[PDB]
Amino acid sequence: TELQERWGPVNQADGFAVTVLSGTYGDISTFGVSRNDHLISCMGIAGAP
Amino acid sequence: GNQRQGVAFIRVNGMELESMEGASFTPSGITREEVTGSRVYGWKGKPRAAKVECKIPGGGPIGLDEIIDWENITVEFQADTGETWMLANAWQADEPKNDGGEISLVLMAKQSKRIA
Amino acid sequence: GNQRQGVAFIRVNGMELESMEGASFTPSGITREEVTGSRVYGWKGKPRAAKVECKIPGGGPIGLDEIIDWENITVEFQADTGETWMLANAWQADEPKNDGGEISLVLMAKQSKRIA
Amino acid sequence: GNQRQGVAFIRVNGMELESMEGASFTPSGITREEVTGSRVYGWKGKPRAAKVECKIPGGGPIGLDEIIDWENITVEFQADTGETWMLANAWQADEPKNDGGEISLVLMAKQSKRIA
Amino acid sequence: GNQRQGVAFIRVNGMELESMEGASFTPSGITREEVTGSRVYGWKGKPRAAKVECKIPGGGPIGLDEIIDWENITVEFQADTGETWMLANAWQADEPKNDGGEISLVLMAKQSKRIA
Amino acid sequence: GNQRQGVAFIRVNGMELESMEGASFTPSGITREEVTGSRVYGWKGKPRAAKVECKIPGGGPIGLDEIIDWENITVEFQADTGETWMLANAWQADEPKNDGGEISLVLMAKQSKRIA
Amino acid sequence: MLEETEAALLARVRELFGATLRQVEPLTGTWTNEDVHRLFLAPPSVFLAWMGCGEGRTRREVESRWAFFVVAELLNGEPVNRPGIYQIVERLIAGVNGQTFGPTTGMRLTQVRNLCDDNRINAGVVLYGVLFSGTTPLPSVVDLDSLDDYERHWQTWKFPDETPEFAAHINVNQEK
Amino acid sequence: MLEETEAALLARVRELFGATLRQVEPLTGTWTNEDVHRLFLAPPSVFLAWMGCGEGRTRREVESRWAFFVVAELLNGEPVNRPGIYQIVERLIAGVNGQTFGPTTGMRLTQVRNLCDDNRINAGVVLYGVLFSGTTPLPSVVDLDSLDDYERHWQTWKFPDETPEFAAHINVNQEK
């Protein structure tokens, strides 16, 4: 909500979110299906030390 | 669709010149010529200067003196279909003459650019 | 039966060019010329380059720049009666000019072969 | 507004000369010409003298002898649109001839100045 | 292919001298004259100095004083086809006559190397 | 730019001699012949005198007696582009032939300086 | 591509003149000697009429000849607004000269006839008529689109009829 | 610029002839076979009629053809003033030749037709008709003028319809 307000055509501020998920492949797939947002990007890792 | 060239507009310094009919544009490039000897071999190059031949009504607002003092101008030949060519640093060639309310302008430039 | 040539099609790189009238084809060969002395002796040879001259509308989809940059193309002169000739590695000769929506192309090649 | 040239008046010593059609005026200046070598470079100048070509009916009050004895006169080419030019110390060039009640005068001068 | 030389570019210390219609080149080597007695008896050797003859339009960036004061330069005769000879430790010869706005000029050196 | 020299003004004591189509200049300096033995062996020096060759239409203010009586004059060869050479203590050389209404004339001096 | 061109000219006329002209309407046929007693003139108004097409430069272009028939009223031998009708004719010429109109381009003025004989003078209408010629192209060949899987190639050598047949039923995409 | 040219020609004719000509009046259309029985001739009088305009040299000028129809009376097969009518014709030609009349310039005489058939001889009128051609320009494009304070600049990037919109409402002249 905050970024879409910023990324709106009036506020003119630009923001992008970067996240990393540690888990198994199924969880990352489910999260990617769930989110569906063009302002957030995630990287999936399995068993990150 | 397959639109074809209709009227051609001749502009100098971003201002239209009244060109009556059949304004001619010759692009700058190389004039390839035959090389014939024992047998035909290929073609020979020769540099060429871009040229715009237009015809302007005499006594117009442009004036004859302003025409004959065009050492450095920027000609533009625009085809109504959309393609236009610009002459960088063109000058008046030939011998201008105001015969019968009519003048012929041969504006020649080093090279022509396919702008727009 | 004894059909004659009607329209002539000028093609470059397997694509038709709009020709108005009098698109002339001259085959590549030898120009036999007189040898006159004390009496008539025979004929003298001189190699030639095959040459197709055709008139195209300006401002068309072909464009003037692509015409003036035809160093190596493969022209084909096809008579609607059935016979056709192909120019091996032709190039644009002469001085192209876009006079009143009109351009004349003299595509000249080392040899012309009667394909098909 | 954008009036064009209509008729042109040719005067000598402040008196009209009856010019039938298409009176020609070439201004005095420089005749720029191409300079092509390894590539196109620019333009070359060459001095030119102003010229007026007018056709007068023969046998008029002007006469033929007075015409052929015009070593020093002051010609004025006036375009009816308003612009006029004056020839400084013009003289009759060419070979005058009274053919079919017609004479052609090429009044040529060192310089033409845009007075008025 | 089909790139028979018609135009050549002369260069002096990376300046690309303005050349005229006729540019001439003679590579350095051995001139092979005749040594003929009772029989043909082969040929005879003789040294030759590399020479480039070119005409320059006057009033260019180069100027004539810089021409007459050229004592140690490295010139490059490049062909439109691609034949690029180079002359090291060159010098201008003869009289740089400034006739009719053209600089008749010759530059010669003791070694000629075909680079690229 | 685009001011390649085509016309030159010759001046004597600030009089601007009436010169015809062909005007020629050779600046003073060293004429660089060759001495070649087994190898090229460089070049050899030789002095040269500044020379201006011009044709004058007769009957002008200058006259011909003043031409033949010129022993010590200051000459200035100005180019339309702007290259202006100067010769101090000059003299007319050769025979000033008055052939066909033209005064062939050559002016020679021992020094040529490029002023402005 | 004529109909698109005439629509373009009509739209241009409507934009240029607006409410000055009462109406604009294409005219079927050139102006004959009974068009005055048959049409809904409602002057002042202009009619665009296609007068045919002469041969063009190529075999794909023609020189279409259009006409603008301008109408007004001449009550009591007096034009309703002579400056108005002259301005209408002049602006129609100026705004429809050179400018392209759809596929057609190079609209060149050719003729302007007064075109007012007794039939129209006694009918109280002036009929100043403009003509135009334009380089209009011909429509291109209709394209095609279809995708069918190539599976069979049937070749038959043209032997004499009652000679035993020779053929190959290739049937590509067959694996064995 | 045709109506102004007509006004200039009429003013010049009135100035040149004055009381010699009973009246001058523009004529709707060229002279037909019935204008004699329908016009208020009141001879001697001169009528100026626009006969159209052919294509000029350029795309902004035309060759407009005007006509001067001169009327008189021929009672008992004798014109009222043969020197008078001949002088009228010659003076009208001389004073309207070459001289500019408003924007039109270079009036050139092209034809002078007798134009006196039975219809007009039986009606007691001579109709010496002069024709003229002149290089008249077309009106220029109408200028414009407006000053509105530039304050907002909305720019929308052309993404596909249902893709979330991207735009910038710039709103210049804002300070913070």
Q: What is the DSSP string of G3-62?
A: HHHHHHHHHHHHHHHTTSSSEEEE-SSS--SSGGGTS---SSEEEEEEEEEEE-SSSSEE
Q: Where are the alpha helices (DSSP H) in H52-155?
A: 82-95, 118-121
* Burial letters G143-168, b for 16+ CB under 10 A, else e: eeeeeeeeeeeeeeeeeeeeeeeeee
DSSP assignment letter at H139 = P
- Coil, helix or strand for B36? strand
Cβ contact F14:F31 at 8 Å: no
Q: How far is D33 from chain E (nearest CA, A)?
A: 13
**D72 part of contact set with chain B, CB < 8 Å:** no
Q: State residue G7 phi and psi, 5-degree precision.
A: -60, -40
- Coil, helix or strand for E98? strand
Secondary structure element (H or E) that encloses residue G118, with its range: helix G118-121
Cβ contact E15:E4 at 8 Å: no
Residue with the two structure tokens 């200067």 = B49
**F20 part of contact set with chain E, CB < 8 Å:** no
DSSP assignment letter at D32 = B
Among the listed residues H57, H46, H143, H52, the one whose alpha carbon sits nearest the alpha carbon of residue H96 = H46
- Distance, in Å, from the CA atom of E113 to the CA atom of F50, rounded to the nearest integer, reads 35
Query: Can you point out the beta strands (E) in chain E?
Result: 8-12, 24-26, 29-30, 33-34, 43-44, 47-48, 50-57, 73-79, 84-93, 98-99, 102-109, 112-114
**B34 part of contact set with chain D, CB < 8 Å:** no
Q: Do G57 and C19 touch (CB under 8 A)?
A: no
Task: Specify the resolution in Å.
Answer: 3.8
| Residue to substitute from B16, B51, B64, B112, interface D, most D β-carbons within 10 A | B64
**H105 part of contact set with chain D, CB < 8 Å:** yes
Q: Provide the CA B76 distance to its chain's centre, in angstroms.
A: 8
DSSP assignment letter at F8 = E
Which residues in chain B touch residue F1, judged by CB atoms under 8 angstroms apart? 72, 89
**H113 part of contact set with chain D, CB < 8 Å:** no
Transcribe B92-103 into DSSP letters.
EBS----BTTEE
Number of residues written out for chain F: 116
CB pairs under 8 A between B and G: 35
Q: Provide the CA C26 distance to its chain's centre, in angstroms.
A: 6
| Residue to substitute from E3, E4, E7, interface B, most B β-carbons within 10 A | E4
- Distance, in Å, from the CA atom of D15 to the CA atom of D23, rounded to the nearest integer, reads 16
DSSP assignment letter at E64 = H
| Amino acid making up residue H174 | Q
- Distance, in Å, from the CA atom of F110 to the CA atom of F112, rounded to the nearest integer, reads 7
Among the listed residues C59, C75, C16, the one whose alpha carbon sits nearest the alpha carbon of residue G140 = C16
- Distance, in Å, from the CA atom of G107 to the CA atom of E88, rounded to the nearest integer, reads 64
- Distance, in Å, from the CA atom of G38 to the CA atom of G21, rounded to the nearest integer, reads 20
Cβ contact H113:H126 at 8 Å: no
- Distance, in Å, from the CA atom of B65 to the CA atom of D50, rounded to the nearest integer, reads 12
Q: Do F4 and D47 touch (CB under 8 A)?
A: no
Determination approach: cryo-EM
Q: Do B3 and G100 touch (CB under 8 A)?
A: yes
* CB-neighbour burial class of residue F84 (10 A; exposed 0-12, middle 13-18, buried 19+): middle
Q: Do C49 and B31 touch (CB under 8 A)?
A: no
Residue with the two structure tokens 């490295």 = E74
Cβ contact G135:B4 at 8 Å: yes
- Distance, in Å, from the CA atom of G54 to the CA atom of E108, rounded to the nearest integer, reads 67
Which residues in chain B touch residue H135, judged by CB atoms under 8 angstroms apart? 101
Q: In chain G, count of helices (H) and strands (E)?
A: 3, 7
Cβ contact B72:B91 at 8 Å: yes
List subunits contacting chain E, requiring 3 or more Cβ pairs under 8 Å: B, C, D, F
A40-45 vs A17-22, strand pairing mode: parallel
- Coil, helix or strand for G86? helix
Cβ contact B43:E4 at 8 Å: yes
Separation in Å, CA E11 to CA D56, E6, E109: 58, 17, 14
- Distance, in Å, from the CA atom of B71 to the CA atom of F25, rounded to the nearest integer, reads 27
Q: Which two tokens stand for residue G171?
A: 């049937």
- Distance, in Å, from the CA atom of D24 to the CA atom of D50, rounded to the nearest integer, reads 11
- Distance, in Å, from the CA atom of B62 to the CA atom of H58, rounded to the nearest integer, reads 15
Cβ contact E44:E35 at 8 Å: yes
Which residues in chain F touch residue B107, judged by CB atoms under 8 angstroms apart? none
**F82 part of contact set with chain D, CB < 8 Å:** no
Question: Which residues in chain G (21-50) have CB-CB distances under 8 A to chain B?
Answer: none
- Distance, in Å, from the CA atom of G92 to the CA atom of G78, rounded to the nearest integer, reads 22
Which residues in chain H touch residue B19, judged by CB atoms under 8 angstroms apart? 58
Q: Do G59 and C7 touch (CB under 8 A)?
A: yes
Residue D12, beta-bridge partner list? D75
| Amino acid making up residue D85 | W
Classify residue C20 as left (phi > 0), alpha (psi -120 to 50) or beta. Answer: alpha
- Distance, in Å, from the CA atom of H161 to the CA atom of B39, rounded to the nearest integer, reads 64
Q: Which two tokens stand for residue C35?
A: 């040898």
D75-79 vs D84-88, strand pairing mode: antiparallel
Q: Provide the CA A44 distance to its chain's centre, in angstroms.
A: 11
Cβ contact G113:H52 at 8 Å: yes
Q: Do C57 and G58 touch (CB under 8 A)?
A: yes
Residue H142 CB contacts under 8 Å (≥ 6 apart), including other chains: none
Q: Do B28 and D40 touch (CB under 8 A)?
A: yes
- Distance, in Å, from the CA atom of H42 to the CA atom of H20, rounded to the nearest integer, reads 12
- Distance, in Å, from the CA atom of F53 to the CA atom of F92, rounded to the nearest integer, reads 10
Number of residues written out for chain H: 176
Cβ contact F13:F75 at 8 Å: no
Taking the alpha carbons of F9, F10, F14, F15 in that order, is the dihedral positive or negative?
negative
**F96 part of contact set with chain E, CB < 8 Å:** no
Residue A12 CB contacts under 8 Å (≥ 6 apart), including other chains: H168
Which residues in chain E touch residue D45, judged by CB atoms under 8 angstroms apart? none
- Distance, in Å, from the CA atom of F81 to the CA atom of E58, rounded to the nearest integer, reads 8
- Distance, in Å, from the CA atom of H166 to the CA atom of H155, rounded to the nearest integer, reads 9
Q: How far is E84 from chain C (nearest CA, A)?
A: 22
Cβ contact D46:D30 at 8 Å: yes
Separation in Å, CA H32 to CA A8, D20, F5, F100, H113: 74, 33, 68, 71, 14
- Distance, in Å, from the CA atom of E10 to the CA atom of E108, rounded to the nearest integer, reads 13
CB pairs under 8 A between B and E: 21
Transcribe E29-44 into DSSP letters.
EE--EE--SSS---EE
Among the listed residues D50, D61, D30, the one whose alpha carbon sits nearest the alpha carbon of residue D91 = D50
Secondary structure element (H or E) that encloses residue C67, with its range: helix C64-68
- Distance, in Å, from the CA atom of C55 to the CA atom of G57, rounded to the nearest integer, reads 9
> ∠E57-E62-E68 over CA atoms, to 5°?
95
| Of residues E63, E68, E100, nearest to F22 (C-beta) | E100
Separation in Å, CA E98 to CA E20, E59, G171: 14, 11, 83
Among the listed residues D94, D63, D76, D81, the one whose alpha carbon sits nearest the alpha carbon of residue D11 = D76
- Distance, in Å, from the CA atom of E52 to the CA atom of C42, rounded to the nearest integer, reads 44
Q: Do B42 and C110 touch (CB under 8 A)?
A: yes
**G4 part of contact set with chain B, CB < 8 Å:** no
- Distance, in Å, from the CA atom of F106 to the CA atom of F97, rounded to the nearest integer, reads 11
Residue C42, beta-bridge partner list? C35
Bond preceding residue B47 cis, omega within 30 of 0: no
Cβ contact C47:C54 at 8 Å: no
Q: How far is E77 from chain F (nearest CA, A)?
A: 20
Bond preceding residue G44 cis, omega within 30 of 0: yes
* CB-neighbour burial class of residue B113 (10 A; exposed 0-12, middle 13-18, buried 19+): middle
Q: State residue B74 phi and psi, 5-degree precision.
A: -130, 90
Q: Considering only alpha carbons, which residue of chain A is nearest residue H156?
A: A9
| Of residues D3, D34, D83, nearest to B49 (C-beta) | D34
- Coil, helix or strand for G102? coil
Separation in Å, CA H36 to CA G152, H32, H132: 87, 8, 22
| Residue to substitute from G105, G110, G141, G142, interface B, most B β-carbons within 10 A | G105
Residue B12, beta-bridge partner list? B75
- Distance, in Å, from the CA atom of B8 to the CA atom of G108, rounded to the nearest integer, reads 12
Which residues in chain C touch residue G141, judged by CB atoms under 8 angstroms apart? none
A 10 A CB-CB count for B2 gives 16
Q: Do H29 and G98 touch (CB under 8 A)?
A: no
Residue A17 CB contacts under 8 Å (≥ 6 apart), including other chains: A3, A39, A40, A41
Separation in Å, CA G94 to CA A13, B18, E72, F91, G1: 51, 14, 68, 69, 23
**D83 part of contact set with chain B, CB < 8 Å:** yes
Q: Provide the CA G41 distance to its chain's centre, in angstroms.
A: 21
- Distance, in Å, from the CA atom of H7 to the CA atom of E78, rounded to the nearest integer, reads 71
Transcribe D63-82 into DSSP letters.
-SHHHHT-SSB-EEEEETTS
- Coil, helix or strand for G109? strand
- Coil, helix or strand for D50? strand
Query: Can you point out the beta strands (E) in chain B?
Result: 8-12, 16-17, 24-26, 33-36, 40-44, 50-57, 73-79, 84-92, 102-109, 112-113
- Coil, helix or strand for G127? coil
Q: Do B58 and D39 touch (CB under 8 A)?
A: no
Residue with the two structure tokens 């309407």 = G25
Which residues in chain B touch residue D82, judged by CB atoms under 8 angstroms apart? 59
- Distance, in Å, from the CA atom of F33 to the CA atom of F46, rounded to the nearest integer, reads 7
Secondary structure element (H or E) that encloses residue H5, with its range: helix H2-17
Residue with the two structure tokens 């004429």 = F31
Which residues in chain G touch residue C18, judged by CB atoms under 8 angstroms apart? 58-60
Q: Do H57 and B19 touch (CB under 8 A)?
A: no
| Amino acid making up residue D65 | D
Q: Considering only alpha carbons, which residue of chain B is nearest residue C101?
A: B5
Separation in Å, CA G161 to CA G153, G156, G164: 21, 12, 8
- Distance, in Å, from the CA atom of H131 to the CA atom of H92, rounded to the nearest integer, reads 11
- Distance, in Å, from the CA atom of G38 to the CA atom of E85, rounded to the nearest integer, reads 86
**H137 part of contact set with chain D, CB < 8 Å:** yes
Cβ contact D112:D50 at 8 Å: yes
Cβ contact G96:G25 at 8 Å: no
Cβ contact B58:D4 at 8 Å: yes
* Burial letters D70-82, b for 16+ CB under 10 A, else e: beebebbbbbbbe
End-to-end C-alpha distance for chain A, whole angstroms: 33
Secondary structure element (H or E) that encloses residue B67, with its range: helix B64-68
- Distance, in Å, from the CA atom of H159 to the CA atom of H166, rounded to the nearest integer, reads 7
- Coil, helix or strand for H9? helix
Residue G109 CB contacts under 8 Å (≥ 6 apart), including other chains: G93, G97, G130, G131, G132, H55, H59, H62
Transcribe D79-107 into DSSP letters.
ETTS-EEEEETBEE-S----BTTEEEEEE
Cβ contact B12:B73 at 8 Å: yes
Q: Which two tokens stand for residue B78?
A: 């625009």
Transcribe F40-105 into DSSP letters.
---EE--EE-EEEEEEEETTSSS-SHHHHT-SSEEEEEEESSS-EEEEEEEEEES---EETTEEEE
| Of residues B59, B65, B97, nearest to D81 (C-beta) | B59
| Of residues B7, B101, B102, nearest to H59 (C-beta) | B7
Instruction: Report, in angstroms and rounded to the nearest whole number, the Rg of chain G calculated over CA atoms.
Output: 28
Q: Do G59 and C57 touch (CB under 8 A)?
A: no
- Distance, in Å, from the CA atom of G22 to the CA atom of G42, rounded to the nearest integer, reads 7
- Distance, in Å, from the CA atom of F98 to the CA atom of B98, rounded to the nearest integer, reads 39
